[PDB]
mmCIF file of all heavy atoms in Angstrom:
data_model
loop_
_atom_site.group_PDB
_atom_site.id
_atom_site.type_symbol
_atom_site.label_atom_id
_atom_site.label_comp_id
_atom_site.label_asym_id
_atom_site.label_seq_id
_atom_site.Cartn_x
_atom_site.Cartn_y
_atom_site.Cartn_z
ATOM 1 N N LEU M 21 79.747 116.049 101.370
ATOM 2 C CA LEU M 21 79.595 115.049 100.345
ATOM 3 C C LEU M 21 78.178 115.041 99.772
ATOM 4 O O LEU M 21 78.002 114.838 98.560
ATOM 5 C CB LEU M 21 79.913 113.639 100.887
ATOM 6 C CG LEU M 21 81.369 113.346 101.196
ATOM 7 C CD1 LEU M 21 81.490 112.005 101.905
ATOM 8 C CD2 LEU M 21 82.218 113.325 99.930
ATOM 9 N N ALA M 22 77.167 115.191 100.639
ATOM 10 C CA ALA M 22 75.756 115.110 100.197
ATOM 11 C C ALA M 22 75.409 116.177 99.164
ATOM 12 O O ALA M 22 74.504 116.001 98.380
ATOM 13 C CB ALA M 22 74.849 115.152 101.428
ATOM 14 N N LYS M 23 76.113 117.324 99.196
ATOM 15 C CA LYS M 23 75.881 118.407 98.276
ATOM 16 C C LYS M 23 76.879 118.443 97.123
ATOM 17 O O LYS M 23 76.803 119.318 96.235
ATOM 18 C CB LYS M 23 75.828 119.720 99.021
ATOM 19 C CG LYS M 23 74.518 119.878 99.795
ATOM 20 C CD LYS M 23 74.400 121.352 100.217
ATOM 21 C CE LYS M 23 73.014 121.619 100.788
ATOM 22 N NZ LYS M 23 72.978 122.858 101.636
ATOM 23 N N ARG M 24 77.858 117.546 97.100
ATOM 24 C CA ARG M 24 78.923 117.613 96.123
ATOM 25 C C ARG M 24 78.409 117.115 94.777
ATOM 26 O O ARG M 24 77.619 116.157 94.725
ATOM 27 C CB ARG M 24 80.063 116.709 96.638
ATOM 28 C CG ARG M 24 81.288 116.711 95.723
ATOM 29 C CD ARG M 24 82.220 115.536 96.030
ATOM 30 N NE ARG M 24 83.524 115.646 95.373
ATOM 31 C CZ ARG M 24 83.743 115.420 94.107
ATOM 32 N NH1 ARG M 24 82.792 115.024 93.275
ATOM 33 N NH2 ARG M 24 84.992 115.572 93.622
ATOM 34 N N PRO M 25 78.895 117.646 93.677
ATOM 35 C CA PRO M 25 78.610 117.023 92.389
ATOM 36 C C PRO M 25 78.985 115.526 92.381
ATOM 37 O O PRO M 25 79.947 115.094 93.011
ATOM 38 C CB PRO M 25 79.505 117.834 91.415
ATOM 39 C CG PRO M 25 79.605 119.178 92.060
ATOM 40 C CD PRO M 25 79.682 118.887 93.526
ATOM 41 N N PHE M 26 78.214 114.767 91.621
ATOM 42 C CA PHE M 26 78.431 113.319 91.536
ATOM 43 C C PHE M 26 79.784 113.010 90.942
ATOM 44 O O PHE M 26 80.309 113.726 90.102
ATOM 45 C CB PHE M 26 77.361 112.647 90.727
ATOM 46 C CG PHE M 26 75.998 112.504 91.291
ATOM 47 C CD1 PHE M 26 75.516 113.345 92.266
ATOM 48 C CD2 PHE M 26 75.165 111.521 90.836
ATOM 49 C CE1 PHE M 26 74.253 113.266 92.816
ATOM 50 C CE2 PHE M 26 73.893 111.389 91.365
ATOM 51 C CZ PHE M 26 73.478 112.282 92.313
ATOM 52 N N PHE M 27 80.335 111.872 91.373
ATOM 53 C CA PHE M 27 81.503 111.318 90.702
ATOM 54 C C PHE M 27 81.165 110.988 89.249
ATOM 55 O O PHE M 27 80.057 110.528 88.953
ATOM 56 C CB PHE M 27 82.080 110.104 91.447
ATOM 57 C CG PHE M 27 82.526 110.460 92.822
ATOM 58 C CD1 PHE M 27 81.987 109.879 93.966
ATOM 59 C CD2 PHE M 27 83.545 111.418 93.007
ATOM 60 C CE1 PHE M 27 82.399 110.236 95.212
ATOM 61 C CE2 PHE M 27 83.948 111.781 94.276
ATOM 62 C CZ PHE M 27 83.393 111.204 95.388
ATOM 63 N N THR M 28 82.114 111.245 88.349
ATOM 64 C CA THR M 28 81.796 111.164 86.934
ATOM 65 C C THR M 28 82.024 109.790 86.357
ATOM 66 O O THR M 28 82.877 108.998 86.786
ATOM 67 C CB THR M 28 82.612 112.160 86.088
ATOM 68 O OG1 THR M 28 83.919 111.753 85.963
ATOM 69 C CG2 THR M 28 82.645 113.553 86.698
ATOM 70 N N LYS M 29 81.208 109.487 85.353
ATOM 71 C CA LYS M 29 81.379 108.216 84.674
ATOM 72 C C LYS M 29 82.687 108.173 83.855
ATOM 73 O O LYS M 29 83.328 107.126 83.771
ATOM 74 C CB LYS M 29 80.193 107.904 83.741
ATOM 75 C CG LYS M 29 78.880 107.814 84.521
ATOM 76 C CD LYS M 29 77.776 107.341 83.541
ATOM 77 C CE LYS M 29 76.666 108.344 83.361
ATOM 78 N NZ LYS M 29 75.892 108.155 82.083
ATOM 79 N N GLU M 30 83.102 109.292 83.253
ATOM 80 C CA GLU M 30 84.261 109.282 82.383
ATOM 81 C C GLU M 30 85.570 109.105 83.109
ATOM 82 O O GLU M 30 86.580 108.648 82.640
ATOM 83 C CB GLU M 30 84.269 110.614 81.584
ATOM 84 C CG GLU M 30 82.869 111.042 81.077
ATOM 85 C CD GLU M 30 82.231 112.086 82.027
ATOM 86 O OE1 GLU M 30 82.694 113.284 82.051
ATOM 87 O OE2 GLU M 30 81.291 111.723 82.749
ATOM 88 N N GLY M 31 85.620 109.566 84.301
ATOM 89 C CA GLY M 31 86.773 109.698 85.243
ATOM 90 C C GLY M 31 86.746 108.522 86.142
ATOM 91 O O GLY M 31 87.149 107.397 85.774
ATOM 92 N N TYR M 32 86.238 108.685 87.349
ATOM 93 C CA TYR M 32 86.107 107.601 88.330
ATOM 94 C C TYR M 32 85.434 106.390 87.722
ATOM 95 O O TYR M 32 85.889 105.235 87.956
ATOM 96 C CB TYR M 32 85.361 108.104 89.546
ATOM 97 C CG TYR M 32 85.097 107.034 90.588
ATOM 98 C CD1 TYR M 32 86.119 106.334 91.195
ATOM 99 C CD2 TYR M 32 83.800 106.680 90.918
ATOM 100 C CE1 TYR M 32 85.843 105.336 92.141
ATOM 101 C CE2 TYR M 32 83.511 105.721 91.856
ATOM 102 C CZ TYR M 32 84.545 105.036 92.483
ATOM 103 O OH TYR M 32 84.338 104.058 93.418
ATOM 104 N N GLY M 33 84.328 106.547 86.979
ATOM 105 C CA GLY M 33 83.636 105.358 86.507
ATOM 106 C C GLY M 33 84.461 104.489 85.613
ATOM 107 O O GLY M 33 84.233 103.284 85.509
ATOM 108 N N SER M 34 85.471 105.079 84.934
ATOM 109 C CA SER M 34 86.236 104.321 83.961
ATOM 110 C C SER M 34 87.365 103.506 84.566
ATOM 111 O O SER M 34 87.893 102.624 83.872
ATOM 112 C CB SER M 34 86.875 105.263 82.925
ATOM 113 O OG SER M 34 87.989 105.997 83.452
ATOM 114 N N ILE M 35 87.804 103.754 85.778
ATOM 115 C CA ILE M 35 88.987 103.071 86.308
ATOM 116 C C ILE M 35 88.601 101.655 86.712
ATOM 117 O O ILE M 35 87.479 101.332 87.101
ATOM 118 C CB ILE M 35 89.622 103.838 87.459
ATOM 119 C CG1 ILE M 35 88.831 103.836 88.741
ATOM 120 C CG2 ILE M 35 90.015 105.278 87.045
ATOM 121 C CD1 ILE M 35 89.559 104.345 89.975
ATOM 122 N N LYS M 36 89.589 100.792 86.639
ATOM 123 C CA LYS M 36 89.454 99.420 87.131
ATOM 124 C C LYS M 36 89.428 99.402 88.663
ATOM 125 O O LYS M 36 90.261 100.074 89.289
ATOM 126 C CB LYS M 36 90.620 98.547 86.625
ATOM 127 C CG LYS M 36 90.669 98.374 85.105
ATOM 128 C CD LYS M 36 89.515 97.589 84.559
ATOM 129 C CE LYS M 36 89.577 97.533 82.990
ATOM 130 N NZ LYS M 36 88.264 97.101 82.466
ATOM 131 N N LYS M 37 88.510 98.643 89.220
ATOM 132 C CA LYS M 37 88.226 98.639 90.647
ATOM 133 C C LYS M 37 88.248 97.233 91.203
ATOM 134 O O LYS M 37 87.518 96.349 90.757
ATOM 135 C CB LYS M 37 86.876 99.297 90.923
ATOM 136 C CG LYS M 37 86.802 100.734 90.411
ATOM 137 C CD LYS M 37 85.472 101.435 90.687
ATOM 138 C CE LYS M 37 85.363 102.731 89.890
ATOM 139 N NZ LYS M 37 85.263 102.561 88.441
ATOM 140 N N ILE M 38 89.156 97.004 92.164
ATOM 141 C CA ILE M 38 89.392 95.715 92.784
ATOM 142 C C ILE M 38 88.973 95.831 94.255
ATOM 143 O O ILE M 38 89.476 96.710 94.943
ATOM 144 C CB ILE M 38 90.849 95.282 92.664
ATOM 145 C CG1 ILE M 38 91.330 95.157 91.184
ATOM 146 C CG2 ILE M 38 91.079 94.005 93.419
ATOM 147 C CD1 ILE M 38 91.871 96.382 90.561
ATOM 148 N N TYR M 39 88.034 94.995 94.694
ATOM 149 C CA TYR M 39 87.455 95.095 96.028
ATOM 150 C C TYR M 39 87.970 93.976 96.880
ATOM 151 O O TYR M 39 87.709 92.813 96.598
ATOM 152 C CB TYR M 39 85.922 95.059 95.894
ATOM 153 C CG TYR M 39 85.190 95.446 97.154
ATOM 154 C CD1 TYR M 39 84.743 96.750 97.344
ATOM 155 C CD2 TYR M 39 84.939 94.509 98.175
ATOM 156 C CE1 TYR M 39 84.079 97.112 98.499
ATOM 157 C CE2 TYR M 39 84.264 94.900 99.305
ATOM 158 C CZ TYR M 39 83.845 96.193 99.488
ATOM 159 O OH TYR M 39 83.223 96.554 100.628
ATOM 160 N N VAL M 40 88.692 94.322 97.945
ATOM 161 C CA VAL M 40 89.302 93.398 98.891
ATOM 162 C C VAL M 40 88.604 93.555 100.228
ATOM 163 O O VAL M 40 88.454 94.689 100.726
ATOM 164 C CB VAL M 40 90.807 93.645 99.001
ATOM 165 C CG1 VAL M 40 91.456 92.640 99.942
ATOM 166 C CG2 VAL M 40 91.513 93.611 97.664
ATOM 167 N N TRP M 41 88.229 92.446 100.860
ATOM 168 C CA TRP M 41 87.526 92.535 102.124
ATOM 169 C C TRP M 41 87.685 91.257 102.918
ATOM 170 O O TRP M 41 88.051 90.224 102.373
ATOM 171 C CB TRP M 41 86.030 92.868 101.886
ATOM 172 C CG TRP M 41 85.219 91.763 101.304
ATOM 173 C CD1 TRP M 41 85.345 91.148 100.080
ATOM 174 C CD2 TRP M 41 84.093 91.142 101.942
ATOM 175 N NE1 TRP M 41 84.372 90.178 99.968
ATOM 176 C CE2 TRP M 41 83.596 90.171 101.089
ATOM 177 C CE3 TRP M 41 83.451 91.327 103.170
ATOM 178 C CZ2 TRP M 41 82.501 89.350 101.368
ATOM 179 C CZ3 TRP M 41 82.358 90.519 103.464
ATOM 180 C CH2 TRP M 41 81.895 89.553 102.578
ATOM 181 N N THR M 42 87.338 91.330 104.203
ATOM 182 C CA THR M 42 87.114 90.161 105.045
ATOM 183 C C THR M 42 85.719 90.220 105.656
ATOM 184 O O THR M 42 85.271 91.284 106.100
ATOM 185 C CB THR M 42 88.182 89.986 106.138
ATOM 186 O OG1 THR M 42 87.747 88.913 106.968
ATOM 187 C CG2 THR M 42 88.350 91.214 107.018
ATOM 188 N N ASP M 43 85.077 89.051 105.735
ATOM 189 C CA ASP M 43 83.790 88.961 106.406
ATOM 190 C C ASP M 43 83.951 88.929 107.910
ATOM 191 O O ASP M 43 82.892 88.881 108.605
ATOM 192 C CB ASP M 43 82.993 87.777 105.887
ATOM 193 C CG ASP M 43 83.508 86.388 106.186
ATOM 194 O OD1 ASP M 43 84.273 86.266 107.151
ATOM 195 O OD2 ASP M 43 83.146 85.454 105.458
ATOM 196 N N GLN M 44 85.153 89.051 108.425
ATOM 197 C CA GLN M 44 85.353 89.195 109.868
ATOM 198 C C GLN M 44 85.576 90.617 110.300
ATOM 199 O O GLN M 44 85.876 90.882 111.468
ATOM 200 C CB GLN M 44 86.522 88.326 110.347
ATOM 201 C CG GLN M 44 86.263 86.881 110.076
ATOM 202 C CD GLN M 44 85.045 86.296 110.722
ATOM 203 O OE1 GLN M 44 85.021 86.314 111.963
ATOM 204 N NE2 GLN M 44 84.074 85.832 109.979
ATOM 205 N N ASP M 45 85.367 91.587 109.427
ATOM 206 C CA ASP M 45 85.454 92.995 109.743
ATOM 207 C C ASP M 45 84.315 93.363 110.693
ATOM 208 O O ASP M 45 83.164 93.116 110.370
ATOM 209 C CB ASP M 45 85.399 93.776 108.427
ATOM 210 C CG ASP M 45 85.647 95.249 108.547
ATOM 211 O OD1 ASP M 45 85.281 95.851 109.609
ATOM 212 O OD2 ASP M 45 86.193 95.808 107.568
ATOM 213 N N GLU M 46 84.658 93.927 111.861
ATOM 214 C CA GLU M 46 83.708 94.243 112.917
ATOM 215 C C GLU M 46 83.181 95.680 112.872
ATOM 216 O O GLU M 46 82.418 96.078 113.757
ATOM 217 C CB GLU M 46 84.290 93.919 114.275
ATOM 218 C CG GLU M 46 84.701 92.487 114.459
ATOM 219 C CD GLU M 46 83.601 91.561 114.761
ATOM 220 O OE1 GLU M 46 82.425 91.960 114.829
ATOM 221 O OE2 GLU M 46 83.910 90.326 114.880
ATOM 222 N N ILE M 47 83.530 96.432 111.843
ATOM 223 C CA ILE M 47 82.911 97.767 111.612
ATOM 224 C C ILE M 47 82.297 97.866 110.242
ATOM 225 O O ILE M 47 81.129 98.275 110.132
ATOM 226 C CB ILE M 47 83.841 98.915 112.002
ATOM 227 C CG1 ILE M 47 83.095 100.237 111.822
ATOM 228 C CG2 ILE M 47 85.171 98.877 111.279
ATOM 229 C CD1 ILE M 47 83.671 101.429 112.580
ATOM 230 N N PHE M 48 83.000 97.521 109.178
ATOM 231 C CA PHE M 48 82.432 97.425 107.835
ATOM 232 C C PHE M 48 81.899 95.991 107.722
ATOM 233 O O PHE M 48 82.546 95.081 107.212
ATOM 234 C CB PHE M 48 83.429 97.774 106.742
ATOM 235 C CG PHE M 48 83.704 99.231 106.552
ATOM 236 C CD1 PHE M 48 83.591 100.166 107.539
ATOM 237 C CD2 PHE M 48 84.052 99.694 105.295
ATOM 238 C CE1 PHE M 48 83.833 101.510 107.299
ATOM 239 C CE2 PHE M 48 84.335 101.018 105.066
ATOM 240 C CZ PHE M 48 84.239 101.942 106.065
ATOM 241 N N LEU M 49 80.695 95.805 108.261
ATOM 242 C CA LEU M 49 80.140 94.464 108.478
ATOM 243 C C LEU M 49 79.792 93.838 107.140
ATOM 244 O O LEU M 49 79.618 94.527 106.129
ATOM 245 C CB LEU M 49 78.864 94.614 109.296
ATOM 246 C CG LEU M 49 78.981 95.235 110.676
ATOM 247 C CD1 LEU M 49 77.631 95.378 111.385
ATOM 248 C CD2 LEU M 49 79.978 94.476 111.482
#
């Protein structure tokens, strides 16, 4: 991943993104 080309603004950047989470997650703190 560190050497991969960046995600593109036209592609990935353009999609609608909905972020779902809990603050009780014990790994993704």
Side-chain angles (χ1 to χ4, degrees):
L21 289 172
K23 286 194 171 160
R24 182 196 192 284
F26 288 24
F27 299 119
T28 74
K29 299 186 242 158
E30 318 98 72
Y32 176 59
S34 74
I35 71 168
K36 296 293 176 196
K37 302 181 193 67
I38 300 88
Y39 192 96
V40 183
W41 71 297
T42 173
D43 67 22
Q44 299 300 299
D45 187 328
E46 302 280 1
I47 184 160
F48 283 27
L49 299 178

